[PDB]
Amino acid sequence: SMQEEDTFRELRIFLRNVTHRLAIDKRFRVFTKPVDPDEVPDYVTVIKQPMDLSSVISKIDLHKYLTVKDYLRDIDLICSNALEYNPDRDPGDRLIRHRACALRDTAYAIIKEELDEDFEQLCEEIQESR
Template structure:
């Protein structure tokens, strides 16, 4: 499946470390009080495996959600994490752009 090729590089970079798995109560007891719609790379991986993404916008939306959540929770606390989330989104956008033709073919196959 093409989406797994796109997702895998996002998971295996230094910028992804804080976003690999859901935030635990132990790490951030108030996280779910602030973040109502959490997202992480393991959830994206699971959605890729279940073939839930119909197009690149669905995929990008989930990566963007990681970035929004990182800013909402970490700005003023841990700004370095927000910067890493921005870099993760930039990497995702780069990969989406670099794989534009393959994505268009995959999306066409899903639609038919």
């Protein structure tokens, strides 16, 4: 219905705002764009499901997220991809892992502080009705 499409539009506005705040954070620059094969050839061969904040923005605009949980699944994929690709004790690996955990923690904390639980529940119930 029209009421439901208004609900999903509000969700998209919210998600674009969260994603923007993550994307402008200097710590998360490394997650803002897809990994370049030219500069990192083995990534395409280790990470089966690449995800980045630019792709998240594209998916928001394609109406691919109907709940905050659907969105956080892709935030979690950005993080888990980074942990899998950077498992070594080397400082370059530990720096990316620290930033990946910070990206995940920051996204969850923004949503916990700013998303009304009844709004996420409404999104869930509309989605389950389809």
